[PDB]
Amino acid sequence: PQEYTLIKLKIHLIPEFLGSIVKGREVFVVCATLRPETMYGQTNCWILPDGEYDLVLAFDQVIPDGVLCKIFDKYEDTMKECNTVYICSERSAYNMAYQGIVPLIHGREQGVSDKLLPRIVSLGKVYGEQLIGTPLSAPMTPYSLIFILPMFSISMEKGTGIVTSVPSDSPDDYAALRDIKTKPLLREKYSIKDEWILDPLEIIEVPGFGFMTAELLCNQYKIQSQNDSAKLKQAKEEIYKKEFYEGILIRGKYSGMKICDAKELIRESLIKDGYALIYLE
């Protein structure tokens, strides 16, 4: 029952097809991480192309034993406290509703019965593929626009089904990004443009590994595709732990600190500046 940082990546250019649905509201794509420290190295964002994601109305402010949420009679009642849209899985939007991050509204249950059934405010459904190439304004990374690209190893059953890419220090991200870089047939299939593919960033030094720890571990485990999920799971646990203790930040406000010393502060800052939320799951 764990504490995630939910990172907000703002859509920088709203696709035509979503302009009617969105209506001058700020839209953010949202992703859950355990490693806010790593957000200095975002190169892209990852989405499941066949995944179905909702455009979910959300509270502008959150109030961060157990937790509150709010219900309203109708869509029109929320427009006061809610001028914000999050793209995410329906599943994860329900979790956010039950922690007070999105509004609920009075729905009536299907069928013969009267029973009150709380619903989120979905403005529409969208497939991931329809968002590939979308520019996002990402917090902390010095590339400051980054793009949505496809990753086929994403589970819709976890987080929001949309994920951050730090190929410098995430084996999954290294692997999915290398699959894009080295498979021209795959680029052509998703109309991937060369300018959407940004290089890894040097952000975290680990004694004996340097600044591309994910690439070295992928090699050491012999990870050949983003689909090698036993090896990736294992390697993800290794890098996590290794970087927690031995990793040194070489970027941003807290450069020169060990990650175990800076992680909390970095996370506090993200929540305080509005770049992220706490999300339990």
Numbering used by the authors: 255 to 318, 325 to 541
Excerpt from the publication:
Interestingly, Iax3 has a well-defined β-sheet in the apo-structure, whereas all the holo-structures show a significantly different conformation with shifts of up to 8.9 Å. Another difference between the apo- and holo-structures is the position of helices α1 and α2 adjacent to I4ae at the editing site, which needs to open (∼1.5 Å) to accommodate ligands. Overall, the CmLeuRS insertions are 25 to 45 Å distant from the editing site and thus are presumably not directly involved in posttransfer editing, although we cannot exclude this possibility in the context of the full-length protein and tRNA.
Similar to other LeuRSs, the C. muris LeuRS contains a predicted editing domain exhibiting highly conserved motifs that are important for the hydrolysis of tRNALeu mischarged with noncognate amino acids, such as isoleucine or norvaline, while excluding cognate Leu-tRNALeu. The structures show the typical seven-β-strand and three-α-helix fold of the LeuRS connective polypeptide domain (CP1), plus archaeon/eukaryote-specific insertions, denoted I1ae, I2ae, I3ae, and I4ae.
